[PDB]
Design a protein around this ligand. Structure first.
Ligand SMILES: [Hg+2]
Ligand code: NA
Ligand code: NA
Ligand code: NA
Length: 406
């Protein structure tokens, strides 16, 4: 049945209708606005709850599944596609934001390498490492926030080891195969509550807006992000698919319409993963051998929409703060945005938590994420669509390159 998609679409229209009517005909205070958004807050807790189980077991399962003999090349072909498309999205975003103009870096760069290799695996599950220079001597502290970057590196390295251990490591492959299946089943349970949670998430965001003048202030910023997301989705990604796979890229995209439409409502690449599998494997007839690796791994590692949005958002905030941006500052933004997209989880608002790392890399407060938080719900919806579209296209791109091994 179509209840999953029809109900989710009905949640979005009811959230906008609920949010606009409540905003106009009611005078909710700050506390009442927070309580009104509570049902959507609980959905965020449910989605953040499965972030760690899903990311860890997805990375281990995908890499471990790849047969060591030759499927490793299939894995390498994917990471090159993931990195190339994210760089293109980041570069495209910086060009658009710099052209349109809508509005201590070493320590931050070194913190990205430190977080790739956490000192503790349990601590990396809910804490991150930050260094500051004080007197100058570097002082490091562990602050809250799951270190997704460190877990990804270990989970991929762990998946590589157990996959290559043959029968000695089969129990670990069986363990994380079942764990990955269980996490996806739990995500399906959360989809029963998502229509209600999404209703108050969209409604709550609209109610928070005060006078609609900020939307006018942020209108050009949204155009830059929406223009970049449109260019990457409609021009760049189809162009890459056509070159590698001499097939109509837009016919391939039509087969993903349910997944793309699902992502445009729930704003979660991990939550829409089951739809991406169904669309890629059945509508597009992509091999399940490579789909079972590209999609679950790319649901969090390949985020072109987030990477573009992080670069545009960071440069836009810098423009607002009247902060000059040299070639060096632009380059660190590109690196930080690329890592921020990797560290972002396939959940609504993931892009905001990782933007603090991008803002700090150029010396900006972590509280400047509230200069663009008003319209994040809309821009987050389109981020996810491009994030999952990248994985879907990469699924067909990797399959073409892996004809010899399949
Ligand atoms: Hg919103
Ligand atoms: Na990418
Ligand atoms: Na993705
Ligand atoms: Na990510």
């Amino acid at each position: 049945n179509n209840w999953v998609l029809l109900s989710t679409v009905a949640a979005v229209v009811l959230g906008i209708t609920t949010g606009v009517l409540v905003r106009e005909h009611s005078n909710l205070s700050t506390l009442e606005k927070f309580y009104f958004a509570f049902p959507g807050e609980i959905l965020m807790r449910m989605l953040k709850l499965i972030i760690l189980p899903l990311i860890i077991s997805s990375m281990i399962t995908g890499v471990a599944a790849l047969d060591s003999n030759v499927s490793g090349k299939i894995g390498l072909r994917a990471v090159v596609y993931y990195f190339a498309t994210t760089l293109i999205a980041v570069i495209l975003g910086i060009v658009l934001v710099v052209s349109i103009k809508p509005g201590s870096t070493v320590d931050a760069m070194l913190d990205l390498i430190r977080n790739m290799f956490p000192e503790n695996l349990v601590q990396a599950a809910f804490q991150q490492y930050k260094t500051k220079r004080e007197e100058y001597k570097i002082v490091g502290m562990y602050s809250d926030g799951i270190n997704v970057l460190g877990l990804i590196v270990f989970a991929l390295v762990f998946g590589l080891v157990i996959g290559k251990m043959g029968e000695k490591g089969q129990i670990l492959v069986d363990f994380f195969n079942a764990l990955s299946d269980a996490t996806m089943k739990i995500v399906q349970i959360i989809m029963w509550y998502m229509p209600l949670g999404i209703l108050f998430l969209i409604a709550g965001c609209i109610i928070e807006v005060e006078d609609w003048e900020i939307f006018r202030k942020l209108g050009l910023y949204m155009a830059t992000v929406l223009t970049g997301l449109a260019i990457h989705s409609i021009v760049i990604l189809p162009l890459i698919y056509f070159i590698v796979v001499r097939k109509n890229p837009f016919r391939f995209a039509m087969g993903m319409a349910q997944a793309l439409l699902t992502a445009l409502m729930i704003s979660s690449s991990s939550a829409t993963l089951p739809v991406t599998f169904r669309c890629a494997e059945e509508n597009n007839q992509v091999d399940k051998r490579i789909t079972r690796f590209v999609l679950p791994v790319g649901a969090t590692i390949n985020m072109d929409g987030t990477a573009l949005y992080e670069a545009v958002a960071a440069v836009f905030i810098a423009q607002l703060n009247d902060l000059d941006l040299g070639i060096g500052q632009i380059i660190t933004i590109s690196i930080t945005a690329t890592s921020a997209s990797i560290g972002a989880a396939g959940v609504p608002q993931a892009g905001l938590v990782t933007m603090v790392i991008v803002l700090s890399a150029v010396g900006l407060p972590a509280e400047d994420v509230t200069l663009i938080i008003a319209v994040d719900c809309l821009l987050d919806r389109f981020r996810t669509m491009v994030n999952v579209l990248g994985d879907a296209f990469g699924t067909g791109i990797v399959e073409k390159l892996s004809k010899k091994e399949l």
